[PDB]
Amino acid sequence: MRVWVGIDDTDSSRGMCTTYLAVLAMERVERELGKVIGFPRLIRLNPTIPYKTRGNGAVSFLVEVDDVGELVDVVNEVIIEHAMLDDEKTNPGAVFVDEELAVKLKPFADKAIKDVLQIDEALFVIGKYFIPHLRHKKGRGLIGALAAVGAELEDFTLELIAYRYPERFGTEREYDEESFFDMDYELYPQTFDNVDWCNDVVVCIPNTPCPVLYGIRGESVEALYKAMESVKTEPVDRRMIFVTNHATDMHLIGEEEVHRLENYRSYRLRGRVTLEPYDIEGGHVFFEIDTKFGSVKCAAFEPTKQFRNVIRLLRKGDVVEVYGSMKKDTINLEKIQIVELAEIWVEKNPICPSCGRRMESAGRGQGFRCKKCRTKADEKLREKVERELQPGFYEVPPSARRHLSKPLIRMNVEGRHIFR
Ligand SMILES: Nc1ncnc2c1ncn2[C@@H]1O[C@H](COP(=O)(O)OP(=O)(O)CP(=O)(O)O)[C@@H](O)[C@H]1O
Numbered sequence: 001m002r003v004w005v006g007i008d009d010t011d012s013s014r015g016m017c018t019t020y021l022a023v024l025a026m027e028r029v030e031r032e033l034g035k036v037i038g039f040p041r042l043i044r045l046n047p048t049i050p051y052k053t054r055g056n057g058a059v060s061f062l063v064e065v066d067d068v069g070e071l072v073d074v075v076n077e078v079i080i081e082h083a084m085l086d087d088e089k090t091n092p093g094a095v096f097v098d099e100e101l102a103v104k105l106k107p108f109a110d111k112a113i114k115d116v117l118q119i120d121e122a123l124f125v126i127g128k129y130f131i132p133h134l135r136h137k138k139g140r141g142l143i144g145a146l147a148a149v150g151a152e153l154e155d156f157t158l159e160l161i162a163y164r165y166p167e168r169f170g171t172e173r174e175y176d177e178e179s180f181f182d183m184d185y186e187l188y189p190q191t192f193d194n195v196d197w198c199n200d201v202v203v204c205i206p207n208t209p210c211p212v213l214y215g216i217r218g219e220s221v222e223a224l225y226k227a228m229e230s231v232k233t234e235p236v237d238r239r240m241i242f243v244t245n246h247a248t249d250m251h252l253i254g255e256e257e258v259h260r261l262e263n264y265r266s267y268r269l270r271g272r273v274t275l276e277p278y279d280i281e282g283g284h285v286f287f288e289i290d291t292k293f294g295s296v297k298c299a300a301f302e303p304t305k306q307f308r309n310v311i312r313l314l315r316k317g318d319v320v321e322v323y324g325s326m327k328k329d330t331i332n333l334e335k336i337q338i339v340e341l342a343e344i345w346v347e348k349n350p351i352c353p354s355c356g357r358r359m360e361s362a363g364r365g366q367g368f369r370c371k372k373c374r375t376k377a378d379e380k381l382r383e384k385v386e387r388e389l390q391p392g393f394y395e396v397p398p399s400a401r402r403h404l405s406k407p408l409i410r411m412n413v414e415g416r417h418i419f420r
């Protein structure tokens with residue numbers, strides 16, 4: 001029968017990752033029980049959650065097997081031989097679900113991506129639907145496991161993950177930097193967010209001691225595969241393509257959707273600027289705005305680099321839309337849409353019609369003049385100031401992009417200030 005297998009929490013900060021474990025588990029199924037139908041899914045979840053670092057993404061894949069219990073056994077073996085069970089950080093979870101049963105997990109998954117979950121719940125669910133599972137330590141991996149099975153994908157992107165030969169691991173990666181940029185020129189936007197031009201950093205490569213070499217994001221399999229051959233790196237052992245929820249803002253809740261705001265949730269909301277920009281300590285920029293929910297702290301943190309510039313040009317009265325997560329009672333900006341420019345009427349003194357300099361007052365009510373000529377004028381000129389800010393959309397540079405952050409290149413809207 002056809003069965004969805006879901007895994008996560010199989011990584012420590014040492015040298016495993018959920019996916020590599022999942023890719024192994026896949027290989028073993030292809031050889032013992034049956035075959036993997038389609039692509040595996042790499043479902044990122046609520047990115048604010050504690051003990052998630054780094055990045056919060058479960059895995060799942062569909063199979064055909066004559067016996068369910070066998071499948072589990074094979075999955076169970078895999079976990080035991082590869083998961084860092086030593087680490088109190090990691091507590092693997094796995095689920096096994098009928099084709100026809102997965103639809104029922106859409107709400108649970110949705111909550112896993114936009115909310116916070118107790119293990120109680122996942123346990124209750126597994127009880128309810130008589131779902132075969134594996135919990136190996138704490139059953140925490142079971143939340144993510146279920147979610148990677150229930151997540152419905154309206155929008156989706158692809159990531160071609162390439163893994164190393166295990167000899168190297170914890171070592172550094174040899175790779176051709178230019179060959180990566182060259183690729184991006186040729187195939188953008190079919191392969192987006194794999195390099196930051198403005199900062200000369202290749203983005204699709206981890207610092208971490210994990211098995212990933214590169215994980216390349218894109219739209220088609222044809223694009224992706226083109227990325228591969230075009231890239232020069234130290235040899236590749238395993239390679240899988242995952243259909244993912246990266247770059248879909250799937251984590252975002254809109255202002256029409258709830259009473260209050262909470263920490264550990266991400267939001268899209270419209271706001272008028274109250275406080276103005278003011279730098280803080282590490283290289284940050286703060287400002288408050290006003291909403292249906294009251295006064296709300298919004299920030300661009302130092303790792304946003306340039307993007308701080310477009311924030312620093314914010315004035316009281318600006319109408320804006322913000323995109324980010326709420327932690328420590330403040331919005332960490334992913335994108336921003338300047339909605340209505342706030343117009344500023346001012347009354348400066350008359351410019352002198354000869355020299356160009358500003359006329360100075362000539363008395364209590366004696367108008368203005370320019371002594372360097374014999375020129376004069378009696379009232380003040382009112383204007384609108386013309387600041388360096390165009391309406392529309394602005395995003396953080398790709399090296400500061402969060403996994404779920406939908407980048408401008410993928411929204412068909414107007415006024416998109418894509419910086420390259
Ligand atoms: N919304 C949520 N509420 C509560 N717990 C959640 C949750 N989303 C995920 N979790 C759980 O927290 C744990 C996350 O730590 P984990 O190591 O598994 O990274 P996972 O997907 O985040 C990641 P990666 O491939 O980079 O290595 C998982 O057990 C997961 O099930």
Ligand SMILES: [N-]=[N+]=NCC(=O)NCCCCN
Binds near residue numbers: 193195205215400401
């Ligand atoms: N493409 N890709 N893979 C991952 C990625 O985009 N990382 C972005 C940079 C995150 C900063 N630590």
Ligand SMILES: [Mg+2]
Binds near residue numbers: 018056058059144
């Ligand atoms: Mg996970």
Ligand SMILES: [Mg+2]
Binds near residue numbers: 009
């Ligand atoms: Mg873990």
Ligand SMILES: [Zn+2]
Binds near residue numbers: 352353354357373
């Ligand atoms: Zn003059």
